[PDB]
RNA sequence: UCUGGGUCGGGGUUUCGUACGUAGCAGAGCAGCUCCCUCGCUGCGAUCUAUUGAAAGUCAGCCCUCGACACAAGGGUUUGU
RNA sequence: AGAUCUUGGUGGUAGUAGCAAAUAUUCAAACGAGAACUUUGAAGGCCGAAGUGGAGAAGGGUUCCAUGUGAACAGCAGUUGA
């Protein structure tokens, strides 16, 4: 986690056109690799893996 | 084996406490053969039993 | 998402990068070195390595 | 060779962190004995009494942060034992632990 | 007479403790 | 990117850090952490603390 | 494995606050030494200053090492349409 | 078959509650089939002279002291022991 500073563009608010700080969470997201495909068929008992 | 008797006799002969009785850890068999105060005197003279000095309590700080 | 809180464009002005392993007070290594100047470890570093 | 001897430094502070006051020094010698079992593989580890004094030098809770020891793997050809080797760990007095590597030491 | 080897072992049999402890004065064997 | 403040220690205070003090006489101070704040609150002179900017410029 | 994970070491970060020793014509002063000196020198003396944002710790549940050292194709118990 | 029956024996509970008042142990060696507990040595600690020290009165009655044993006892163990 860390925090930022940003300009708010919310009209009618007190913090309009003002700087605020806000906690943020950094989530490292390296690219995913696709390795398969699953099909599903709708049945009167739910989805089942085709 | 067990030198409980010899430490007690050495304390009485040396006129000290068992705190101040030092029996040789290497000559355990020699000391174990001394079942009388006369042999304890011989071991003290030979140096197998030694009276340790009094723990230092200096008064240099107080002075 | 139809509310004004959503679909609101975010424009960051500053991202904090002080040390979170304590009360960090410098954003970058270069800013820390510029503020404090040379230290004893660097003074002997230039002495031993010329 | 299996009669090797090496000079290590052990971060006692690392291995004692979290132990209670009346158990820090006893745990330090359990961690030293467990340490020597790792780099030497011998379950028979003997700790020199001078090293025992060094650990207990500042009482039972203020154990030194670092200790410089010398592991000495020796032959157990003194009696019929399940272990053919034993490691005798000794004490090495040092003035500083800076830039102290694990060094092989001769006889 | 005292040589280097006898002096080396003498350091062992004269120290019966650590720092601040008394040095051993004698170890005589008689029968 | 806001106003950049300076502490009892004279260090730079970035937004979202420290606290601000508003005395009754109308003066406003700002501190970088509780170490710099509590030194100020104990009537301690910054020119006598070796890690303070005011000390380093005096010496 | 195009190695691995450890243990030390290093660097970073951070915590506290400027270490021991040495030096000073710094220092309330005091006690000695004056053919002496023409204003001097020898000790004791908290504290101060320079060395010195120094010293010390920092994963054990901090970050990066690819520096050094050793070790890692070993063990045991089971499992069949 | 009963009497909260008498005497004796045995279960479940249950390998459970528990073996938590008074700071604290550690290293090496010896003996020994066997050592966390015995002994010796080395450290680190406590009692801190209104003591966990040194001696008595009452009470106990051989617990005193040597040697040996390792059955039972010392609510773990013991090579130790009142
Ligand atoms: Mg934090
Ligand atoms: Mg490191
Ligand atoms: Mg009946
Ligand atoms: Mg009936
Ligand atoms: Mg239980
Ligand atoms: Mg219990
Ligand atoms: Mg006391
Ligand atoms: Mg009494
Ligand atoms: Mg008796
Ligand atoms: Mg029992």
Curated annotation (Swiss-Prot), chain A:
Signal peptide location: none
Post-translational note: It is not required for incorporation of RPL3 into ribosomes.
Cellular localization per UniProt: Nucleus, Nucleolus; Cytoplasm
Task of the protein: Component of the large ribosomal subunit. The ribosome is a large ribonucleoprotein complex responsible for the synthesis of proteins in the cell.
Similarity remark: Belongs to the universal ribosomal protein uL3 family.
Subunit structure: Component of the large ribosomal subunit. Interacts with DHX33.
Protein name, as recorded: Large ribosomal subunit protein uL3
Originating organism: Homo sapiens
Swiss-Prot record, chain B:
Protein name as it appears in the record: Large ribosomal subunit protein eL19
UniProt-annotated location(s): Cytoplasm
Posttranslational mods: Citrullinated by PADI4.
Modification type Phosphoserine: residues: 12
Subunit note: Component of the large ribosomal subunit.
Membership in a protein family: Belongs to the eukaryotic ribosomal protein eL19 family.
Function, as annotated: Component of the large ribosomal subunit. The ribosome is a large ribonucleoprotein complex responsible for the synthesis of proteins in the cell.
Domain of life according to the entry: Eukaryota
Citrulline PTM positions: 4, 15, 37
Curated annotation (Swiss-Prot), chain D:
PROSITE patterns referenced in this protein's UniProt entry, alphabetically: RIBOSOMAL_L31E
MF (Gene Ontology): RNA binding; structural constituent of ribosome
Keyword Protein transport: no
Positions of modified residues (Phosphoserine): 81
Modified residues (N6-acetyllysine): 58
Top-level taxonomic group: Eukaryota
GO biological process: cytoplasmic translation; translation
Protein name: Large ribosomal subunit protein eL31
Species whose genome carries this gene: Homo sapiens
Lineage: Eukaryota, Metazoa, Chordata, Craniata, Vertebrata
UniProt gene name: RPL31
Curated annotation (Swiss-Prot), chain E:
Signal peptide: none
Residues where N6-methyllysine is found: 6
Protein location: Cytoplasm; Nucleus
Protein task: When associated with NACA, prevents inappropriate targeting of non-secretory polypeptides to the endoplasmic reticulum (ER). Binds to nascent polypeptide chains as they emerge from the ribosome and blocks their interaction with the signal recognition particle (SRP), which normally targets nascent secretory peptides to the ER. BTF3 is also a general transcription factor that can form a stable complex with RNA polymerase II. Required for the initiation of transcription.
Subunit structure: Part of the nascent polypeptide-associated complex (NAC), which is a heterodimer of NACA and BTF3 (via NAC-A/B domains). NAC associates with ribosomes through the BTF3/NACB subunit. Both subunits can contact nascent polypeptide chains.
Similarity annotation: Belongs to the NAC-beta family.
Protein name: Transcription factor BTF3
């Amino acid at each position: 986690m860390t925090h930022i500073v940003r300009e708010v563009d919310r009209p009618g608010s007190k913090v309009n056109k003002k700087e605020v700080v806000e906690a943020v969470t950094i989530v490292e997201t390296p690219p995913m690799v696709v390795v398969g495909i699953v099909g599903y068929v709708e049945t009167p008992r739910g989805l089942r893996t085709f | 084996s067990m030198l409980r008797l010899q430490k007690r006799l050495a304390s009485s002969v040396l006129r000290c406490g068992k705190k101040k009785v030092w029996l040789d850890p290497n000559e355990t068999n020699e000391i174990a053969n001394a079942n009388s105060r006369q042999q304890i005197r011989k071991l003290i003279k030979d140096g197998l039993i030694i009276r340790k000095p009094v723990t230092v309590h200096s008064r240099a700080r107080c002075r | 998402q139809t509310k004004r809180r959503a679909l609101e464009k975010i424009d960051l002005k500053f991202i904090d990068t002080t040390s979170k392993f304590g009360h960090g007070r410098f954003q970058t290594m270069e800013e820390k070195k510029a503020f404090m100047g040379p230290l004893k470890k660097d003074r002997i570093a230039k002495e031993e390595g010329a | 060779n299996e009669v090797v001897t090496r000079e290590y430094t052990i971060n006692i502070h690392k291995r004692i962190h979290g132990v209670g006051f009346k158990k820090r020094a006893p745990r330090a010698l359990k961690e030293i004995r467990k340490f020597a079992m790792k780099e030497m593989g011998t379950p028979d580890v003997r700790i020199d009494t001078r090293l025992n004094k060094a650990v207990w030098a500042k009482g039972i809770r203020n154990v030194p942060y670092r200790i410089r020891v010398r592991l000495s793997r020796k032959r157990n050809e003194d009696e019929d034992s399940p272990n053919k080797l034993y490691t005798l760990v000794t004490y090495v007095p040092v003035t500083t632990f800076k830039n102290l590597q694990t060094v092989n030491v001769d006889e | 007479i005292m040589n280097q080897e006898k002096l080396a072992k003498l350091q062992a049999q004269v120290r019966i403790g650590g720092k601040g402890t008394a040095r051993r004065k004698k170890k005589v064997v008689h029968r | 990117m806001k106003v950049e403040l300076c502490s009892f220690s004279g260090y730079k205070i970035y937004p979202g850090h420290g606290r601000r003090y508003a005395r009754t006489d109308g003066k406003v101070f700002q501190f970088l952490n509780a170490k710099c704040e509590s030194a100020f609150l104990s009537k301690r002179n910054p020119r006598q603390i070796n890690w303070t900017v005011l000390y380093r410029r005096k010496h």
